[PDB]
Structures are given as structure tokens and as C-alpha cells.
CSV table of C-alpha atoms and ligand atoms in Angstrom, one decimal:
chain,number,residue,atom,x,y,z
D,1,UNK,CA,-215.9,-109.8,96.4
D,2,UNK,CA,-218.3,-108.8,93.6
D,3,UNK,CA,-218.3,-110.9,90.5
D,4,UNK,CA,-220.0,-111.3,87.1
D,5,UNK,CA,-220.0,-115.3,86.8
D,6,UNK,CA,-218.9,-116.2,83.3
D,7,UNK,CA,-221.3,-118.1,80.9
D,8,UNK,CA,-219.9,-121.8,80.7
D,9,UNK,CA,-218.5,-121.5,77.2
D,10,UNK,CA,-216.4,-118.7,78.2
D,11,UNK,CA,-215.2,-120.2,81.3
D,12,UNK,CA,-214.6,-123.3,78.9
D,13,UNK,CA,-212.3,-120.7,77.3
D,14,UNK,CA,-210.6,-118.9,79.5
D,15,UNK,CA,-209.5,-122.3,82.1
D,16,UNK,CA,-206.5,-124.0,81.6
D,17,UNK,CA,-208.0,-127.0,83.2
D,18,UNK,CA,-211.6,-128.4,83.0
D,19,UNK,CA,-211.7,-131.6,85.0
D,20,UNK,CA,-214.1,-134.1,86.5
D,21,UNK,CA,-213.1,-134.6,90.3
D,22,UNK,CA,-213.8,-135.2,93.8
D,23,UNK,CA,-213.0,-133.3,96.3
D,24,UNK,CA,-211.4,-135.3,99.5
D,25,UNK,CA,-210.7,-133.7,102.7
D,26,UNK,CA,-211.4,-130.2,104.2
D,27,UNK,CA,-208.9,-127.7,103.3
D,28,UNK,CA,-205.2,-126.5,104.4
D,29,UNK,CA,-204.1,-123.2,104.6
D,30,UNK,CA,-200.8,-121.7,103.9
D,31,UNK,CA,-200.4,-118.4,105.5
D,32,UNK,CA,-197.4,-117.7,103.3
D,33,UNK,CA,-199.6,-117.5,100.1
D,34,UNK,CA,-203.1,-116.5,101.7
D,35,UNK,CA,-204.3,-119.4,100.1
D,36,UNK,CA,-206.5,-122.6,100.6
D,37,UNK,CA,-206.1,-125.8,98.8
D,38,UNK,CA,-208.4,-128.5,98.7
D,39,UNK,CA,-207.3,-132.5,98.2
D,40,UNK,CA,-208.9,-133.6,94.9
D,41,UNK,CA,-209.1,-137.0,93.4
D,42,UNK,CA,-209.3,-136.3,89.5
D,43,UNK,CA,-212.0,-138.8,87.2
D,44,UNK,CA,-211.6,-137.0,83.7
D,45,UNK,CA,-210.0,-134.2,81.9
D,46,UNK,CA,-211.9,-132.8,79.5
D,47,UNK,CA,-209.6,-129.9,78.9
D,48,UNK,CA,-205.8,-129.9,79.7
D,49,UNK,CA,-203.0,-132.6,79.2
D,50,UNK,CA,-200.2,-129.9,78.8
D,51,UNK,CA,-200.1,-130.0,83.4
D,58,UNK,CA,-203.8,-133.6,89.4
D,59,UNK,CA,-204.4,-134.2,93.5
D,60,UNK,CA,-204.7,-130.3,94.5
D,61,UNK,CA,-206.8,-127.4,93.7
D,62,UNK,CA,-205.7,-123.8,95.5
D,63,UNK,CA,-208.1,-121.1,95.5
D,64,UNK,CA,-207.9,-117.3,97.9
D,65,UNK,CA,-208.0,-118.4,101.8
D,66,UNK,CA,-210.8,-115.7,102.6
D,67,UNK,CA,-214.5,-115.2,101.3
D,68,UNK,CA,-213.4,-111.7,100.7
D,69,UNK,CA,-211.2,-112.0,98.3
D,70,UNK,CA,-213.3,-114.6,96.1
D,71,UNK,CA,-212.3,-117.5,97.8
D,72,UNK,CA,-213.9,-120.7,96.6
D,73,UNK,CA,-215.6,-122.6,99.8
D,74,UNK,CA,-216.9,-125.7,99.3
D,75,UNK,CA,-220.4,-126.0,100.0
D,76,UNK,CA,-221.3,-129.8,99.9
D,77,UNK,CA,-221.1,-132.3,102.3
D,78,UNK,CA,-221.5,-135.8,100.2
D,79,UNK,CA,-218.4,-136.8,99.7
D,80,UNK,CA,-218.7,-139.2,96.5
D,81,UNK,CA,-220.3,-136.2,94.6
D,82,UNK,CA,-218.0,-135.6,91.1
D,83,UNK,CA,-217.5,-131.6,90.5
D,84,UNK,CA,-216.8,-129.9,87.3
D,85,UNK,CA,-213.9,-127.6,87.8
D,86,UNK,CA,-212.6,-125.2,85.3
D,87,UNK,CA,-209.2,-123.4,86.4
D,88,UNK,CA,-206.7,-121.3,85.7
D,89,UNK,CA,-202.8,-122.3,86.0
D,90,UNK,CA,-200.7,-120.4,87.4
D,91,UNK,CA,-197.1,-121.7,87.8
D,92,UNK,CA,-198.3,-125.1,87.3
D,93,UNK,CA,-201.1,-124.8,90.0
D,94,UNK,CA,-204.5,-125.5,89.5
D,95,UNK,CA,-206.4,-122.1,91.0
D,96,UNK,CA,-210.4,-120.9,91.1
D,97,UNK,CA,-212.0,-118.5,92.3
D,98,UNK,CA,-215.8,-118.1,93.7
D,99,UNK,CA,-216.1,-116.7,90.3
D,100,UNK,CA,-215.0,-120.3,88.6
D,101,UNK,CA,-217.0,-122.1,86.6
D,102,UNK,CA,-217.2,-125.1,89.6
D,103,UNK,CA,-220.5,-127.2,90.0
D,104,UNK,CA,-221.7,-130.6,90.6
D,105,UNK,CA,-221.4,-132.6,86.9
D,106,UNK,CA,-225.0,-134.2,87.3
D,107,UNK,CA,-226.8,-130.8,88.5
D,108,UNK,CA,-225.5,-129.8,84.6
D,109,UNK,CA,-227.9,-130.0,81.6
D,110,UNK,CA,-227.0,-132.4,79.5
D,111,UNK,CA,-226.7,-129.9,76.8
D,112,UNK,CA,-223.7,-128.6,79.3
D,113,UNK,CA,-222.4,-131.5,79.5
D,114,UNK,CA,-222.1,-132.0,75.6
D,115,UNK,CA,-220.7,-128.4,75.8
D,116,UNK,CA,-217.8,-129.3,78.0
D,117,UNK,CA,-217.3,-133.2,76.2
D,118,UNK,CA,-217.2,-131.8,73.0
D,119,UNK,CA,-219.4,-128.7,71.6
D,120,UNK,CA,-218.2,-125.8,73.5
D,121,UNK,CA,-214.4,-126.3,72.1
D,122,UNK,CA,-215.8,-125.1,68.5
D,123,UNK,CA,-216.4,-121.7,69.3
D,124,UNK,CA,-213.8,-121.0,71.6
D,125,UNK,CA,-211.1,-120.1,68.4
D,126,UNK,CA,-213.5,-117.5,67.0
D,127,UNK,CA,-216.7,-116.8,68.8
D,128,UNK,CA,-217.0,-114.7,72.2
D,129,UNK,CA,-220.1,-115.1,74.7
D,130,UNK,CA,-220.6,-111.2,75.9
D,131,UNK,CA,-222.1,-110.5,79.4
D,132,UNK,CA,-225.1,-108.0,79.0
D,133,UNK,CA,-225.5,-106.6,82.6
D,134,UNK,CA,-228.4,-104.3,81.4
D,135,UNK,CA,-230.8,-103.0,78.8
D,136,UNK,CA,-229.8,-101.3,76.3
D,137,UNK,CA,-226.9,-103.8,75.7
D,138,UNK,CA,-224.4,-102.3,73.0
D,139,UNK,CA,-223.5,-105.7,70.9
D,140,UNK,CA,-219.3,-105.0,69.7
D,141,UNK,CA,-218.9,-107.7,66.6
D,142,UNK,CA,-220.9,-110.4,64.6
D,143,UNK,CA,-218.9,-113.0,66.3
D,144,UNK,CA,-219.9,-111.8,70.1
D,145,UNK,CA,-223.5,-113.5,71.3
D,146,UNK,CA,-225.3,-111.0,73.5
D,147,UNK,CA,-226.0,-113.4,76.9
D,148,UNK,CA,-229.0,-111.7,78.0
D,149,UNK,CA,-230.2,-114.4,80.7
D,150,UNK,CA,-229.5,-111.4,83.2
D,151,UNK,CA,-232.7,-109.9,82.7
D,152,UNK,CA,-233.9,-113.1,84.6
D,153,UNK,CA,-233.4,-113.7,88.3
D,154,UNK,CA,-229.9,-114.1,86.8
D,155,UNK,CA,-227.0,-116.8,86.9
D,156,UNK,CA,-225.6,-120.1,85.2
D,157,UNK,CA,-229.8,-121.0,85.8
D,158,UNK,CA,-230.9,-119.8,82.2
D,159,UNK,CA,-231.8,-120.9,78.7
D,160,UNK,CA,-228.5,-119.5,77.1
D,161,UNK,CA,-226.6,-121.0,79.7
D,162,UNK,CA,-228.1,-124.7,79.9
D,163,UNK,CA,-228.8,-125.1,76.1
D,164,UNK,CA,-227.2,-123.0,73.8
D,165,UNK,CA,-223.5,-121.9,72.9
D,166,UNK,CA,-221.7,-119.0,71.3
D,167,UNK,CA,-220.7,-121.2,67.4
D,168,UNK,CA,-220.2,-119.7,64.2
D,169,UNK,CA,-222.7,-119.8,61.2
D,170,UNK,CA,-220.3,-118.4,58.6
D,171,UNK,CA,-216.9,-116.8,58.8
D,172,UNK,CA,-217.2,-113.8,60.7
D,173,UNK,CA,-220.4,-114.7,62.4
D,174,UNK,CA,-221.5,-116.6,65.8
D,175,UNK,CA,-224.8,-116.5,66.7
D,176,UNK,CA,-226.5,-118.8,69.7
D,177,UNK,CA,-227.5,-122.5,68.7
D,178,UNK,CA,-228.5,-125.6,70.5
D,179,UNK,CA,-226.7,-128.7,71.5
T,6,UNK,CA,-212.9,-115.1,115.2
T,7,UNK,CA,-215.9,-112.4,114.9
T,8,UNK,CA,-213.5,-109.4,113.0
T,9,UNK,CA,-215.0,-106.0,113.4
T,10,UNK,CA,-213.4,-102.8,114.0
T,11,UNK,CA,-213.1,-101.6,117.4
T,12,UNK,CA,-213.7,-98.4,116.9
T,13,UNK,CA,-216.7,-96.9,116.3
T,14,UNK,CA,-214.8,-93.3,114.4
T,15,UNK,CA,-213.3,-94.6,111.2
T,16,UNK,CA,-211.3,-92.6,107.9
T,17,UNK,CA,-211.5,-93.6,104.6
T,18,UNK,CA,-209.0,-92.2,101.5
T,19,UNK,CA,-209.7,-92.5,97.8
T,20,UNK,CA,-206.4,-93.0,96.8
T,21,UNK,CA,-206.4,-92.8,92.9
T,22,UNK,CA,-209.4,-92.8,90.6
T,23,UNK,CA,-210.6,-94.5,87.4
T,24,UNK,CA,-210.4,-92.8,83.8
T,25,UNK,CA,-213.7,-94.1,83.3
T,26,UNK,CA,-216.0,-92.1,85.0
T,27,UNK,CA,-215.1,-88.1,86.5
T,28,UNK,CA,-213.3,-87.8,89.7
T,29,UNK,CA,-216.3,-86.5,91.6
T,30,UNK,CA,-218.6,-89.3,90.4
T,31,UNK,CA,-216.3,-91.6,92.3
T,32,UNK,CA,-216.4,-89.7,95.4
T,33,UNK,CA,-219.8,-89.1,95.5
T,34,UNK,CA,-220.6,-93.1,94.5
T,35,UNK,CA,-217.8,-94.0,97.4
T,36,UNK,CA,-220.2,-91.3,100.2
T,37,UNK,CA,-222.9,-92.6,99.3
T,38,UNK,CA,-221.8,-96.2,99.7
T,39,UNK,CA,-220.8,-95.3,103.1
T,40,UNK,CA,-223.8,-93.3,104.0
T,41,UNK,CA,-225.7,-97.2,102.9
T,42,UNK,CA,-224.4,-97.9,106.0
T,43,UNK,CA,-223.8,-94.8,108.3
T,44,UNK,CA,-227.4,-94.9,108.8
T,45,UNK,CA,-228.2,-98.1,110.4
T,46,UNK,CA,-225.2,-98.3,112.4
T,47,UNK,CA,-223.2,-96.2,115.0
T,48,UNK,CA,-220.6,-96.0,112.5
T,49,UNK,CA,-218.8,-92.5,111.2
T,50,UNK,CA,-216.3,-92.0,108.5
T,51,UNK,CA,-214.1,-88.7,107.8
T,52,UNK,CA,-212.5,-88.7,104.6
T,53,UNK,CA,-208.5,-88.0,104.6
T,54,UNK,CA,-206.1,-86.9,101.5
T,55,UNK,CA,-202.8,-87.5,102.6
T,56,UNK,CA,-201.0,-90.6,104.7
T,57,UNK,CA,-203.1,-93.8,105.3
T,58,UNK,CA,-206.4,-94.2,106.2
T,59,UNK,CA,-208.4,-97.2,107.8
T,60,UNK,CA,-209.7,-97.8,104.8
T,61,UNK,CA,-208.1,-97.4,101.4
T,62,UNK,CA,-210.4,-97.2,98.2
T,63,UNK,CA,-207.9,-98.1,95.0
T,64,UNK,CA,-208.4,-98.9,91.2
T,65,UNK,CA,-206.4,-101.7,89.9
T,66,UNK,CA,-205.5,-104.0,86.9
T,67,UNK,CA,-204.5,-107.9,87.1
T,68,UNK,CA,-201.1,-107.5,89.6
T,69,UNK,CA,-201.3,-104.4,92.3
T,70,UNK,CA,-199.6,-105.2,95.0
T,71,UNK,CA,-201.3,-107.7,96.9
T,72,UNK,CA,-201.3,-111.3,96.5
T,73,UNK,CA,-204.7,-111.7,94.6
T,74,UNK,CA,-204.1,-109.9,91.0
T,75,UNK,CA,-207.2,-108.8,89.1
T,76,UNK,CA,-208.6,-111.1,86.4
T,77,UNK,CA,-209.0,-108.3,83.3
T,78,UNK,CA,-211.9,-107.3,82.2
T,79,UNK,CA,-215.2,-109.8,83.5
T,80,UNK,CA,-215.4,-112.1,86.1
T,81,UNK,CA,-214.2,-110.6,89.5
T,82,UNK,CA,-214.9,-106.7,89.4
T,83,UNK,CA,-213.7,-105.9,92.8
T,84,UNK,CA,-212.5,-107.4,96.6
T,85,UNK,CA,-211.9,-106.1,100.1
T,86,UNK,CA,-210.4,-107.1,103.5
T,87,UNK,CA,-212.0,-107.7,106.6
T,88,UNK,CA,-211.0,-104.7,109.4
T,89,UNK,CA,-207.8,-104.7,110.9
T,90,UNK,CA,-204.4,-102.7,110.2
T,91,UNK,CA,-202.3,-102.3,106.8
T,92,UNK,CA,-204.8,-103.8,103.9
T,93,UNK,CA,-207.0,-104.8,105.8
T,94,UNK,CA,-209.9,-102.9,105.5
T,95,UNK,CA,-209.0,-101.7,101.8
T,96,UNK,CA,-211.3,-102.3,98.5
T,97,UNK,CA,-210.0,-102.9,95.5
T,98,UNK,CA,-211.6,-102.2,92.2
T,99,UNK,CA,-210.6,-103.6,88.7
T,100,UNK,CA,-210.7,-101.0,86.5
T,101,UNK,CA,-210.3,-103.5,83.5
T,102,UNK,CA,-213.9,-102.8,83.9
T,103,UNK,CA,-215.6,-99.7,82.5
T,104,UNK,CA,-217.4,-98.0,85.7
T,105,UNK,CA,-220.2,-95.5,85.6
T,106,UNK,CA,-222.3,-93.4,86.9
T,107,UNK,CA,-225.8,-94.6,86.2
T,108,UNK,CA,-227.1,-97.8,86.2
T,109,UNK,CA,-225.7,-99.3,82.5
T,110,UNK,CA,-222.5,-101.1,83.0
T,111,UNK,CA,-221.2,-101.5,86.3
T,112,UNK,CA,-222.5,-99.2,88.9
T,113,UNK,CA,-219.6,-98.5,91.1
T,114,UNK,CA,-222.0,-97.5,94.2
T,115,UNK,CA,-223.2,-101.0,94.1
T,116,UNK,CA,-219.9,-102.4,93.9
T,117,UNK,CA,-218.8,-100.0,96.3
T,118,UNK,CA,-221.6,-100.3,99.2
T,119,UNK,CA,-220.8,-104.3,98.8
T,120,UNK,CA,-216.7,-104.4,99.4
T,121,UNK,CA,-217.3,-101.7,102.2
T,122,UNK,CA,-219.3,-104.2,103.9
T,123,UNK,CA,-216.5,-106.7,103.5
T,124,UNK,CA,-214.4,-103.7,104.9
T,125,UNK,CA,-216.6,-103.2,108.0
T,126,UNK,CA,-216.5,-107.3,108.5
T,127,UNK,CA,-219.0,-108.8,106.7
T,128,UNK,CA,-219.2,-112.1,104.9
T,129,UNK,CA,-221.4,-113.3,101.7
T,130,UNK,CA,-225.2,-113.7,102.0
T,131,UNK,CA,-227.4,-116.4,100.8
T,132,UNK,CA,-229.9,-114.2,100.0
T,133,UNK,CA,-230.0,-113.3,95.9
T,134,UNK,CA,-231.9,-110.0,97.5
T,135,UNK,CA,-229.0,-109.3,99.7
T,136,UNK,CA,-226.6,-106.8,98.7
T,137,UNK,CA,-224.0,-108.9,100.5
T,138,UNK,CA,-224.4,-111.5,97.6
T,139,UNK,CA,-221.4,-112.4,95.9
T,140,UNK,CA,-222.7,-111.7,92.3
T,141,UNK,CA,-223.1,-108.5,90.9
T,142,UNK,CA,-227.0,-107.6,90.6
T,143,UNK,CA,-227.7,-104.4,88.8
T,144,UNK,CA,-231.2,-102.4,89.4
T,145,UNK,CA,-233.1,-101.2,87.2
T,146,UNK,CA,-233.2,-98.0,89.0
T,147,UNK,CA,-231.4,-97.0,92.3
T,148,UNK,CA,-233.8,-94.8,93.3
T,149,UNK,CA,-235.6,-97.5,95.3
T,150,UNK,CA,-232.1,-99.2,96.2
T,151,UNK,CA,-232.6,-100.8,99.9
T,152,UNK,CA,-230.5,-102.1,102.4
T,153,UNK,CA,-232.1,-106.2,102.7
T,154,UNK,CA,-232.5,-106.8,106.2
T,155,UNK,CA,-230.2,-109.9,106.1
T,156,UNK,CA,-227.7,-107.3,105.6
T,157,UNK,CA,-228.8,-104.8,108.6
T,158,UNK,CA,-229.1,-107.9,111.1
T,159,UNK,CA,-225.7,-108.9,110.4
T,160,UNK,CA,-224.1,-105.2,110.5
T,161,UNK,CA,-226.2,-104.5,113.6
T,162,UNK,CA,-224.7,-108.1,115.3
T,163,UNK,CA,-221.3,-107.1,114.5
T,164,UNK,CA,-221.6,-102.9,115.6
T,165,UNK,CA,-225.0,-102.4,117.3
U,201,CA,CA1,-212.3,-108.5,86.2
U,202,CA,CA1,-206.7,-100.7,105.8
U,203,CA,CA1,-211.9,-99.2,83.0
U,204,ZN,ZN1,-217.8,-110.1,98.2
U,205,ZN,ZN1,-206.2,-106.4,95.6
């Protein structure tokens, strides 16, 4: 399992469910589906309403299957995931990580600011240099020439919004 | 329950290709991938045409026949299985990516030496060095690519 993790505007974009929530017992497996679920106790929706106690993600590592990591069991996640027939699914790829280890600028991002430029604007992964731009209203995420990761300027302060009608370009929160 | 093959002769087929890169540039990213690990472990790999290998090297978009479709293009770029018979064993690529040779893009050897070491029964690495991490890390030149020794120890613990 090899993945390119999203920037969190895009994973804002592309999840059918963003949610504040707990998670509450280890998992259970269904050999049936080859996948895990975890017992979640929900705290806030930030994106949704049209579907929550369960969150199903792949059963092995292999196949990018989200493991939970964390041992403190009060500890609110962010969770941003995909519905497929009215099932709440991740991935390792998934935008999932602890709400106060978020900038607060993410935070805004996810309450309110990254919605804006999810109609129009497009964050675009650039895995390396040179890094062919496609449109004015793609924003070239370059925090990959770093160590890499969500850990990175464009990721904890800035978002993908548009200036004019045909153009996003990065900006603060 | 410490999955490795039993065997220390294995066969590998490429069954289809990708449009996005020439048909020998995925062979000779998929042998080199295996040679990554041929030479640090007893390990051996022919290379069959026809019927089913041990392990099965496919391209794929969203659903392809198993139970864990493709995303499009970003986020996952490939999975594997862990040895065993049937799938397991078999690497999956999503060619809703755009593959290449060289190092711009996605480099399908890294991709490739990865999921084969899902395929010969290894799990994820801590270590951001580790070519075992789950996120894709692109080099600025492969010339100097090295196996990380996280990755030998664990290949050498399961094989020898
Ligand atoms: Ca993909
Ligand atoms: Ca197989
Ligand atoms: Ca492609
Ligand atoms: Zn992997
Ligand atoms: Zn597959």
C-alpha cells in the first residue's frame, strides 16, 4: 500500500463525511467483506447530514487499512470518509488525525474556510520538480520538497480559494 | 501469524501493462524491483507468460476484481497481498495514475519494490527512510536508491 496523502482541503472535498469522534473499543472483523470496523462515538459533524456509531476501513495493512494507533481513549479524532452504501469507510490514506494535533488554521479550514473552495478551486499534488501547473484554479502544493506530509506550511495555514473567477491561488486562514 | 512463503523458488507474471509508459519499461521497473530484494535474501523469481504465477503484477482502475476498488487518480496508487495462494501474493497498480520511467511523476520501480515487499510478507515501517513506509517518497535520483536496513532486518527475519 503506497499512497500520496491528500492535502486537507481536498480530503475536505472528496469525503462524504467529516466528523469529530471517539473511537471506542478495538476492532471487529468480518471475514465476509475483508473489512475492519471500529465502534465510534460521534461529537460533531462538520460535513454530512444527508447519512453515526461505526467506521469500516480494509482488514489488512496491505491493502491501506486504517489501524488505529492511539491508546488514550478520551482523545477526539477528525475523520473524513467516503460512503459507500451508507457506510462510513477510510483508508490509511484518509484524512484521520487527532482534532487538537490540528493548526488552528485547520481547524477553521474544516469549521468553515475550506468549504469555499471546494466548488471551484483544486489543491494539486506536486510529487517533484519540475511540477507542470494544469489551470489557474489548481494551487501547486509543493510542501513535498520538504521531509514531506500533512506537516507543512500549505497544509497547516493556507487553502486552495479563489481570487477572481477563474483563479485560486493559496491564502491564509 | 508470521506469513512468508515457504518456498524459497518463486514465479512472477506481468499480466497486462499500462498505456502510460512502453511495455519494456514495465518489465524492466518490475526486475529491478525484484532484484531490490534478490540480493539480500535467498530469494529467486522466474518470470512466466501463460497460467498463474505466485505472484501476479496487474494495472487497474477503481473496481477490478477484488474487494478493495481503486480510488482514481491520487491517494492510493497501488496495494498487494501477503504470500499465500490465489491473490495473495498479487500487486495491484492504479493506473488512474500516469506511471513513468524516470523519477517525475510516479516512479513505478519505487511503487513496485514497495508492494513486492508486501508480496514477500512484509508490513509498513515507521521509518520515513524506509522504503516500506506507507507514503510514496520520490528521490531525487535513483541512482543512489538504497535498501534501509529496517527493511533488510525485517526481510532477513522472515527468509534468512
Ligand atoms: Ca489512486
Ligand atoms: Ca498470488
Ligand atoms: Ca494512467
Ligand atoms: Zn504498503
Ligand atoms: Zn486490487
Amino acid at each position: 500500500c503506497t499512497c500520496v496523502p491528500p492535502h486537507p482541503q481536498t480530503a475536505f472535498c472528496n469525503s462524504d463525511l467529516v466528523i469529530r469522534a471517539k473511537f471506542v473499543g478495538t476492532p471487529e472483523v468480518n471475514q465476509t467483506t475483508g473489512y475492519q470496523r471500529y465502534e465510534i462515538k460521534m461529537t460533531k459533524m462538520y460535513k454530512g447530514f444527508q447519512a453515526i456509531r461505526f467506521v469500516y476501513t480494509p482488514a489488512d495493512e496491505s491493502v491501506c487499512g486504517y489501524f488505529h494507533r492511539s491508546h488514550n481513549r478520551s482523545e477526539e479524532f477528525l475523520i473524513a470518509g467516503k460512503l459507500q452504501d451508507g457506510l462510513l469507510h477510510i483508508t490509511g490514506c484518509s484524512f484521520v488525525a487527532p482534532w487538537n494535533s490540528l493548526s488552528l488554521a485547520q481547524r477553521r479550514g474544516f469549521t468553515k474556510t475550506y468549504t469555499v473552495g471546494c466548488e471551484e478551486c483544486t489543491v494539486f499534488s506536486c510529487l517533484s520538480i519540475p511540477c507542470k501547473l494544469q489551470s489557474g484554479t489548481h494551487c501547486l502544493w509543493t510542501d513535498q520538497l520538504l521531509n514531506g506530509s500533512e506537516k507543512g506550511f500549505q497544509s497547516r495555514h493556507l487553502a486552495c480559494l479563489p481570487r477572481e473567477p477563474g483563479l485560486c491561488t493559496w491564502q491564509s486562514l | 501469524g508470521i506469513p512468508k512463503w515457504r518456498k524459497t523458488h518463486l514465479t512472477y507474471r506481468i499480466v497486462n501493462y499500462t498505456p502510460d509508459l512502453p511495455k519494456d519499461a514495465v518489465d524492466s521497473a518490475v526486475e529491478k524491483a525484484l532484484k531490490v530484494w534478490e540480493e539480500v535474501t535467498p530469494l529467486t523469481f522466474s518470470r512466466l507468460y501463460e497460467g498463474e504465477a505466485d505472484i501476479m503484477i496487474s494495472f487497474a482502475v477503481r473496481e477490478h476484481g477484488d474487494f478493495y476498488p481503486f480510488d482514481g487518480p491520487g491517494n492510493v496508487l497501488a496495494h498487494a497481498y501477503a504470500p499465500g495462494p490465489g491473490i495473495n501474493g498479487d500487486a495491484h497498480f492504479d493506473d488512474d495514475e500516469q506511471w513513468t520511467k524516470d523519477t517525475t511523476g510516479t516512479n513505478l520501480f519505487l511503487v513496485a519494490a514497495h508492494e513486492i515487499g508486501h508480496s514477500l510478507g512484509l508490513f509498513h515501517s515507521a521509518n520515513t527512510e524506509a522504503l516500506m513506509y506507507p507514503l510514496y517518497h520520490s528521490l531525487t535520483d535513483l541512482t543512489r536508491f538504497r535498501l534501509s536496513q529496517d527493511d533488510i532486518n525485517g526481510i532477513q527475519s522472515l527468509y534468512g
